[PDB]
Amino acid sequence: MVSLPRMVYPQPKVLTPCRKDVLVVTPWLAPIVWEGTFNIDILNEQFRLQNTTIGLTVFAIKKYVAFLKLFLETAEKHFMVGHRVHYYVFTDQPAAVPRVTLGTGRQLSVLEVRAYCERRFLSEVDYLVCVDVDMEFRDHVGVEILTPLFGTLHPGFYGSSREAFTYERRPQSQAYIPKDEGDFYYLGGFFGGSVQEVQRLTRACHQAMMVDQANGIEAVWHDESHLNKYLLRHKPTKVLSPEYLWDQQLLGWPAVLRKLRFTAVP
Numbered sequence: 001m002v003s004l005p006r007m008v009y010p011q012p013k014v015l016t017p018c019r020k021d022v023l024v025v026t027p028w029l030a031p032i033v034w035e036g037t038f039n040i041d042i043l044n045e046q047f048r049l050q051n052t053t054i055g056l057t058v059f060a061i062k063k064y065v066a067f068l069k070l071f072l073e074t075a076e077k078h079f080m081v082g083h084r085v086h087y088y089v090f091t092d093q094p095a096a097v098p099r100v101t102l103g104t105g106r107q108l109s110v111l112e113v114r115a116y117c118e119r120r121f122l123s124e125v126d127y128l129v130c131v132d133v134d135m136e137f138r139d140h141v142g143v144e145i146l147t148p149l150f151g152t153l154h155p156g157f158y159g160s161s162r163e164a165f166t167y168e169r170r171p172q173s174q175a176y177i178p179k180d181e182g183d184f185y186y187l188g189g190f191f192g193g194s195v196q197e198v199q200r201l202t203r204a205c206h207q208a209m210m211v212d213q214a215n216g217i218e219a220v221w222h223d224e225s226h227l228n229k230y231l232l233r234h235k236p237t238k239v240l241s242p243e244y245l246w247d248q249q250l251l252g253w254p255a256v257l258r259k260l261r262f263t264a265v266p
């Protein structure tokens, strides 16, 4: 909207690729976010000028409440630092949520679950980032991921052919994807976008799962299977590289990953 200020940074090189080892743009022209493809100073300027607010949602039920401390503490160190952040913790144990110290401009809302509006998101945040709680941030996760709709490449299938993807293969399921279809295998543990697009995705997933339930069938990987079906039919406007959701214990640290930003907790 408003003009960017004078900025001094390296001139982009038209005849020099960012990465020659990986795909950095999808066939529908959505960028694939890898370290080296973006200048965070330019992006931070663009989003701060918009006074962007990012909501981060996590569910912590039963034993999972034990992961909240590390999750929130590391998020404070690496997630959207410098921008407005609103954490939404959905739990069945409100009193068990740890007292984590937050930086300025950041807040946390604890929502007790077992039932209990989506309209609230529309008035409190601009973007929603939905992730798994048994994780920890180890490096920068910033505005470079913000876009109307984004999915993240599953760390165990990013180099696999579509036939090997663990999509739901039964035609009786609404999440069904044939062997000759599919772009990538997105993981259900890290997705997001504008509040509007995220609500459209979750609403579509909810309906598809209800239909499957009625027909007495459960997708092979549940929510993740439906997420993949949705993103196949509604292409994400940005795709995050596996840098954004990795498991170093199970997958190590490949050369193709310059940074490990968000990882599974052992």
Ligand SMILES: CCCCCCO[C@@H]1O[C@H](CO)[C@H](O)[C@H](N)[C@H]1O[C@@H]1O[C@@H](C)[C@@H](O)[C@@H](O)[C@@H]1O
Residues within 6 Å of the ligand: 154, 155, 156, 157, 166, 187, 221, 224, 246, 247, 250, 251, 264
């Ligand atoms: C990460 C290497 C990939 C192969 C390990 C099994 O990964 C599981 O894949 C299915 C889909 O095929 C689901 O996405 C599961 N949620 C995956 O396991 C979970 O995520 C991986 C990354 C590990 O953290 C594992 O411990 C989790 O259960």
Ligand SMILES: [Hg+2]
Residues within 6 Å of the ligand: 017, 018, 019, 036, 037, 038
């Ligand atoms: Hg580059």
Ligand SMILES: [Hg+2]
Residues within 6 Å of the ligand: 057, 128, 129, 130, 198
């Ligand atoms: Hg969400």
Ligand SMILES: [Hg+2]
Residues within 6 Å of the ligand: 202, 205, 206, 209, 223, 226
């Ligand atoms: Hg769902």
Ligand SMILES: [Hg+2]
Residues within 6 Å of the ligand: 201, 202, 205, 206, 223, 224, 226, 227
């Ligand atoms: Hg979904």
